[PDB]
Each structure stands twice: as structure tokens, then as C-alpha cells.
């Protein structure tokens, strides 16, 4: 457990509604067994972007384009969301639910490499990642070069490694991890 | 110990990722235990720390501040054009983080004054970050009086949600609000956060 199931219970009975688009997708992952961000996580991820106004935000890699959704739903026009991912069958479907919702003209998708094609994007404001497909410590010597003046890293799934450790062991980055959904690593670059 | 939130072990590891700690701020903790002040810890601080930095605001407005522990976290976290400002009732409290402040010098963009802290909080405006203590106030009535302070997309940052300094009665009128976006961290005692919506 990360937080006694007692206080997670009482966090998703202060829920509202759910976006029909949400509980679409959670339907798909769900029967294609694809994992996805949790709903506390998603809602955190749409915060934080809110908060940081970014301009660029990129995802590499992104299941049914779950985390691509809850970052494009927090910037106007005026930014950009990247994601790739290997799998087709994501792309498309993240696609098709975007242009449906009026999002696709702040939405770039790729179908392939995922940090391959990410490394192309410069002054990324929001670098997007997930623990339990890439090693941060891998991600980073690929994209450090890519970030922003004070992007922001977000890692999920970063409590369920010699990574966290080293986020929160170097002068550029102020770290902190949340205990929200399975953990979410939050490196803010100084 | 309380009402559980964040599993032990996990608190445990979280704990060891912590760099060394501050002497500014262990001489805080200390001084908050002998003189039975709650303040904020330190997981909690680091949370306030990077919202601020990612939020940048001008105007961080501080209503009741044990041994100025959160414009302490605050004031690291804006510019010299920024201000944080801090309202007490008690006039140690003030003195406290005028101390700290000058010691660093952050006193150049902190206002501290002791008196009523939403008498005085009330005469502000373009607030871009609220902070409260869910132990000290009812939250839907600081907002009812603070709202009109807000700026456009203001953050609110309310301490204390899930337990005493679970789970209380902001939570679920904040919730309601439509006119902002909430989510509950469990963090510390868990942090109530309340974007102001365009
Ligand atoms: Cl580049
Ligand atoms: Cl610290």
C-alpha cells in the first residue's frame, strides 16, 4: 500500500462525474488489458498543467493516449502536446477520440520510437514518462538536452528506483514524489 | 498514529530521498516542539515549494503562519518583484519568521504583520496563492470572504485536509465548486488544492 485504502477509498468518493470520454477509455484499457493513468492521476497531471501554463508538452509513449487527454484538456491553441508510441492501435485510437473532442489541433502523434522521436522536440515545458515501460536515469541521457528552462519532469509509477535516488540527489533539479495513484515523481528543473 | 495516510514504509523511503536537511529549518522544528506550535513537515514544505515555482506568482497571501514555517517555503520559492505575505496573531510567531527572513535575507519580498489574518488577508488583491489551515479555518468561509481577493487562476493551498495537524467538510464544499478544479494529495496530512478556473 502506498496510502491506507481507507483515505483512497474517501478521495474517489469526493469524485465528480466522470468525463463520458474517460469512462470510455477506462472501458478499452480495461478489456484490451492496457494500462492506464489512474483517475487521481490524471486529474493531478491536468493541475499541474494548468498551473505551469506550458507551452510544449511531450509524451513518450502513451496507452489509448490517456496522459496525451489529460494534457491537452489544460492548453489552448497556443501549445502543443507530442506523443508517440509504437503501438498503431494507441495512435489511433488517441486520434480519433481528440479529433471527436475538438483537441487534435493542439495534439501531434507519431506512431514509432518512442525517446527516439521525442529527442527531436527542443524546450519541452512538460516531459511526461512512465517508470514501468522507461529507467528515468535512460530517459534523461537521451532528453536533458530537450527540456525547457524549468520543465517539469512528471514519472508515474515511480513507487510501484537508483532513479528516484538520483533525481533527488543532484543541485539542477528540485524533486519531490507524490504518494498519488502509484506515485508520482515531480523533478522541477532549478 | 492519527489517521494513517501515506504506509510507513513508504513514508520511510520517501523520508530517505530527502537531501540533508537545512539547520534553518531543523532550528524551526525543534522550536515548533518545545513550543507546541503545528507546522508544516518537511514533504509537505517541498509540495508548496515546487507549486510555487511552477505557478510563479507576484502575490502569495499566507493567513496564520506557526513560526512563519509556510512563508518560509514560499519566500524561497519567488522573485524580488514577488511578495508573500504573512498575518499573525501572535506577535512570536512574526518575530520568529522576521528572524529567519532576515537571516537570509528573503525579508526583501515578505510583508509580515501581526493582527486578525483574514481582517487583513480581506484588504488584498490579485492573490495568486492562497494558503490555509483547514484546523484553524472553515474553508468555505474564507472563501466566500477571500474569493473577491483571488486572481484570475489563483491556487488555493489549504494544509490539514485529511487529518489534524479521513478527511473534512472543505473537501467536499470545495468539490462542489465549479468554478474550481480540486484534487486532494495525500501528502503530510493530506493538501487540499483548488485551481481557480478562467
Ligand atoms: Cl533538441
Ligand atoms: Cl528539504
Not at 40 to 69: E, H, N
Not at 94 to 100: C, G, Q, V, W, Y
Not at 153 to 160: D, F
Request: proline share 5%; net charge neutral.
Amino acid at each position: 500500500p502506498i496510502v491506507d485504502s481507507r483515505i483512497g477509498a474517501y478521495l474517489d468518493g469526493l469524485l465528480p462525474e466522470a468525463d463520458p470520454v474517460v469512462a470510455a477509455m477506462e472501458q478499452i484499457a480495461r478489456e484490451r488489458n492496457i494500462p492506464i493513468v489512474d483517475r487521481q492521476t490524471g486529474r493531478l497531471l491536468y493541475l499541474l498543467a494548468r498551473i505551469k501554463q506550458p507551452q510544449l508538452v511531450v509524451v513518450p509513449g502513451d496507452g489509448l493516449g490517456c496522459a496525451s487527454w489529460w494534457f491537452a484538456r489544460a492548453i489552448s491553441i497556443s501549445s502543443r502536446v507530442v506523443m508517440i508510441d509504437p503501438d498503431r492501435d494507441n495512435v489511433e485510437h488517441a486520434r480519433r477520440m481528440l479529433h471527436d473532442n475538438g483537441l487534435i489541433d493542439r495534439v501531434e502523434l507519431q506512431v514509432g520510437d518512442p525517446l527516439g522521436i521525442a529527442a527531436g522536440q527542443r524546450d519541452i515545458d512538460i516531459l511526461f514518462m512512465d517508470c514501468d515501460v522507461f529507467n528515468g536515469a535512460d530517459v534523461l541521457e537521451r532528453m536533458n538536452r530537450c527540456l525547457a528552462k524549468n520543465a517539469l519532469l512528471i514519472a508515474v509509477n515511480a513507487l510501484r528506483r537508483e532513479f528516484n535516488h538520483h533525481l533527488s540527489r543532484r543541485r539542477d533539479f528540485f524533486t519531490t514524489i507524490v504518494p498519488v495513484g502509484n506515485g508520482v515523481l515531480l523533478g522541477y528543473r532549478l
